Ligand binder design. Sequence first.
Ligand SMILES: OC[C@H]1NC[C@@H](O)[C@@H](O)[C@@H]1O
Length: 426
Amino acid sequence: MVYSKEIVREWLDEVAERAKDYPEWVDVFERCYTDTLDNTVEILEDGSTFVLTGDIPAMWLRDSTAQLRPYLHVAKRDALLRQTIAGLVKRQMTLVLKDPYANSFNIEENWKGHHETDHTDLNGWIWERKYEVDSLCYPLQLAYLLWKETGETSQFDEIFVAATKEILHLWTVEQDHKNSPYRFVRDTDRKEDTLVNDGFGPDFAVTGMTWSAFRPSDDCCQYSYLIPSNMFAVVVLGYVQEIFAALNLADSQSVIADAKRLQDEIQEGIKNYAYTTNSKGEKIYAFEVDGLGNASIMDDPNVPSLLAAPYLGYCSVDDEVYQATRRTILSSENPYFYQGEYASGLGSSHTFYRYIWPIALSIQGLTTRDKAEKKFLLDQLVACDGGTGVMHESFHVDDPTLYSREWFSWANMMFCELVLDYLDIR
Ligand SMILES: OC[C@H]1NC[C@@H](O)[C@@H](O)[C@@H]1O
């Protein structure tokens, strides 16, 4: 009901042929690709698409985009799967209108989720209301990628236009968080799951960048201007300009000018505040800054990450500042960089010490021109699966049979992305 088994099986046959020298990769690729398509995607009563992030009836705007993105290739062939992806954009934009500050949404207005512990404005559609700038980038990215890869335009409907307007309004309000209607307190002993200053967050100055409460990891920002999410915002604001001009959408002149104004202001904020200096004295990107002079040197495996900046389309992989940042991220100068017997890579505040993330190994391969480095990382990913033949959230560098999240569809899909990239399937 969501795709053509005939068309998808033939496409996978072709990929397996292209990858015939890499049977270990094919086994995992097919397992990953089929599981997401068969077990996480459902068509709702209104013909729109709901994608399960994991193992409860809630969809993250972030995971759902990254889960479906690698199906864009076969959606060039499979018309029905093309509609399913369009239906996901439609669902995302509808939910953005329900509450543009929420990261995660229920399948229906059922009041499931975190309401018992969370003090914030809530409705029945909200699973979790952690505001993460990237949550609002991902649906815009998906709408744009669907259009570019397949030519599909039905996703650019009135709900799309209204939701785009909501995103621009919110990001603009959050250029000075003193004016924000958003507050968040969770009754928990885990500091990462709540906001300091009774739900308002840490101190900041106005920088031109847009404020975030939490990171793509779902843990709170230390400083409020998250460089990778503002990078992603700059990219998708470009997309908004393109889409409104091309499709002659309602209020395009106003929306295009607004998006451009905001893109330029965030870009100038990045120029003015996002940079710092590493141990060697090289200019690098910081992870989070507050505009008060504080700037962290680290990266988090969750995307958008600094490591993923070229993958997100923010800058060239060849860029000097990016490369210096990359060398810094992938070293012990980054406090989340962990080295062990099986692998070295990136952990997170979100997971245990010494556990590193497959998603960051995949992004590491997606952001190098060196095909030998891509192949090395793909070999490492499959070798570090604890014998499960799928991708986990994190695994211990000294023993990958110790890992978190048995079923992690976004991680499975990032592995698929790197295989396709290695094979020049584009
Ligand atoms: O998969 C849902 C959620 N898990 C924690 C992080 O990986 C975050 O990025 C993700 O959205």
